[PDB]
Assembly symmetry: C2
Homo-oligomer: 425 residues x 2
């Protein structure tokens, strides 16, 4: 197993990071709580389990509640593994790096936790549970900030997991793309994606966005239309995948016919998107790229005669935000919108990323151009009304909008666009 070799280095890195912070904050150790199952109100049914990101940072156990990791960075990390033996229920490489204790029932954990928890930092969601167990330090900000800062630097093990994540997601994206050109409904396209990725809905790192025509302009679109539209014009799919707790996050936009103004508009955004990806470089502030994206959107708006102005004028008047209202992208890893994106240092001192770009960091680059009713209405109420080609806006509105998103690893002397290296056009 190639992962096993890399994982040995991963643990050693986390141990080193753990040593530094527990010594700095004068702690005996850190306790990571995987989480618990949430029960639905007045019911005996449960929400799907979502593991604490700080927990799965150590190991690929993301489907098991009531698990505990006790670490100080010097000794082997203690893993309290939940494993019920009741009759209604029911070894790998990472197992050898932990001292594993089996937990048969949730409230039996206290006998397995350290006796004096005065200087053990509880890292988890369930503060009432932590207090009941005797923990007093819960998610200490210096500790959270330290881990979150270094989470931006992915180990070789993590990079491998994120590559496999894209690989699965790209398979889904190609299958979804094929379903679109066959005239399938949003629901059917989603089924094709889930089938190709072999993912259940709750396996996807975020709710898939599967939008046809006007629905493409809906930034937080979640629904899946069961009925295919009479006419197929555009398709926007924002979807990813999971591998070992690590996420992919990819968006592609398609014109149905492959020709016409919207088809050219998509391709223009593509060339801009690729150009923005290749601007990723160590020592460079991510905010610089976001600014350049606005320039490129303004040029696009100008070239396609959507706004009757030059690119620089569109930027100065603040018109671009009407068509591109969100951030250029974000760090990605264990979390889709990964932590540490705003941090200037370990202490912890719209756009989701402003942090200086360094090697071993992973980003998304997702420029967008949309025709959104409420935003266009606001623009029409300003003095910029005169500058807008409203006829052109009316022409492109039925196509909804455009977003193109890749996941890129930044290396010291090169860039690794995982998504496009997997040949997803």
């Amino acid at each position: 197993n190639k992962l096993a070799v890399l994982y040995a280095e991963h643990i050693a890195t986390l141990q080193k990071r753990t040593r530094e912070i527990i010594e700095r904050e004068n702690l005996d150790g850190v306790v990571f709580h995987s989480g618990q199952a949430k029960r639905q109100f007045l019911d005996d049914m449960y929400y799907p389990f979502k593991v604490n990101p700080q927990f799965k940072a150590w190991l690929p156990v993301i489907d098991n509640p009531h698990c505990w990791i006790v670490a100080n960075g010097t000794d082997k990390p203690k893993l309290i593994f939940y494993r019920p033996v009741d009759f209604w229920h029911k070894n790998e490489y990472w197992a050898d790096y932990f001292d594993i204790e089996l937990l048969v029932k949730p409230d039996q954990v206290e006998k397995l936790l350290p006796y004096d928890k005065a200087r053990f930092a509880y890292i988890g969601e369930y503060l009432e549970v932590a207090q009941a167990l005797g923990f007093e330090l819960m998610n200490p900000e210096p500790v959270m900030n330290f881990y979150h800062y270094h989470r931006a630097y992915k180990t070789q093990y993590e990079l491998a997991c994120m590559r496999e994540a894209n690989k699965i997601a790209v398979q889904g994206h190609k299958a979804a793309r094929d379903a679109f050109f066959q005239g399938k409904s949003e629901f059917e396209i989603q089924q094709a994606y889930l089938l190709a990725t072999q993912h259940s809905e709750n396996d996807t790192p975020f709710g898939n966005i599967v939008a046809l025509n006007e629905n493409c302009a809906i930034l937080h679109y979640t629904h899946f239309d069961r009925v295919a539209p009479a006419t197929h014009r555009s398709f926007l799919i924002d979807a990813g995948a999971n591998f070992n707790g690590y996420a992919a996050d990819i968006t592609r936009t398609y014109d149905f016919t492959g020709e016409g103004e919207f088809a050219e508009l998509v391709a223009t955004m593509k060339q801009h998107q690729i150009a923005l990806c290749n601007q990723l470089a160590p020592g460079k502030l991510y905010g610089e790229l976001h600014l350049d994206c606005h320039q490129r959107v303004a040029q696009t708006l100008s070239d396609f005669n959507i706004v009757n102005l030059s690119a620089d004028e569109i930027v100065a008047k603040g018109i671009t935000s009407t068509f591109f209202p969100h951030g250029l992208g974000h760090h990605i890893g264990l979390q889709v919108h990964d932590v540490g994106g705003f941090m200037a240092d370990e202490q912890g001192a719209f756009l989701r990323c402003t942090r200086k770009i360094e090697a071993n960091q992973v980003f998304t680059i997702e420029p967008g151009l949309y025709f959104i009713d409420s935003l266009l209405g606001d623009l029409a109420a300003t003095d910029n009304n005169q500058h807008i080609n409203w006829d052109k806006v009316a022409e492109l509105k039925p196509f909804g909008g455009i977003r193109i998103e890749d996941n890129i690893i930044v290396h010291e002397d090169s860039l690794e666009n995982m998504t496009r290296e997997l040949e997803l056009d």
Copy 2:
């Protein structure tokens, strides 16, 4: 017809509300749909699950921050959440029965709620939120018990919704069955079910159980094997569907070849299952049927020579529970395991389970317009079989035959049946699911 039936539904809920607020000296009742739960340290959210007490009034189950204010005399007030931000996209029959006011942001609901919330009962999950608004009565038990008791009596509207929920589920079960005989994996079978029901995973009222071979013996099996088994022997699917907040809950078990001892075992269990369905009748304690199920499971174990005893002997020695460890079934409606099933009166008193089965919680006396599941089972579970082998009943068990039947896992057959005054309506088998 649904629009017509819904008028009577609202009238019924109004009258129930009038009775309970008068009895408990209340000004009204507030039903909170709930909120979206955010994942720890993240900006991703859990799927929204609506408060059952809220969707009891209306078919709005995908909307948080909604509030219903009712006293049973005036029209029920519906505070409907409907944001206008540019990230979101911005009149059915049920709308006319509510005085609707739109809520654009969740923290603006206080302006729409009653001024004096002292005698207004808050029915919701978010206590500190309600306390912050001014509410003081948090899910008062006499109010909870009263509503939950009468929740057992489904209105004509609710029955119609449950028929449709069952109609959808059966379409899935047929597609799943076909996939099984085509030799597909558990994951592929689940995909077929979701497609045929046009359900997303989070639309299903519970996590589907799609089990092949030995997995059929796992009662709380949740995984979906991506790899098809090299040998195809058995298939158990426990799966339902949603319509307007109401649930279906259906189980079927299949033998792959349709021949052999396990195939005959499934066939025998089916005839028992149908017979148990027809035992549903007004005036009977549900525990009476549970007892008969154990008798029939014992008879099956005896006839197939799995246990070398008569049916009475197997029951008396408490051996049946090794092969049939759970309850015969439950009330079903807005919730899969619906409320009120253990209540003797509307005060919340418990109808005690029959002797020998202290863990049976569906015990309430059967009446018309109540909806039940009938799910007898016969499984071969390692843990329970191990327990049996350690007892003095070890000598009575045909262990060689058990070993031959173990790779097939187990059997469960489940329908959803409406009890009427004169007849029984097996919704599942009416929809032509063998």
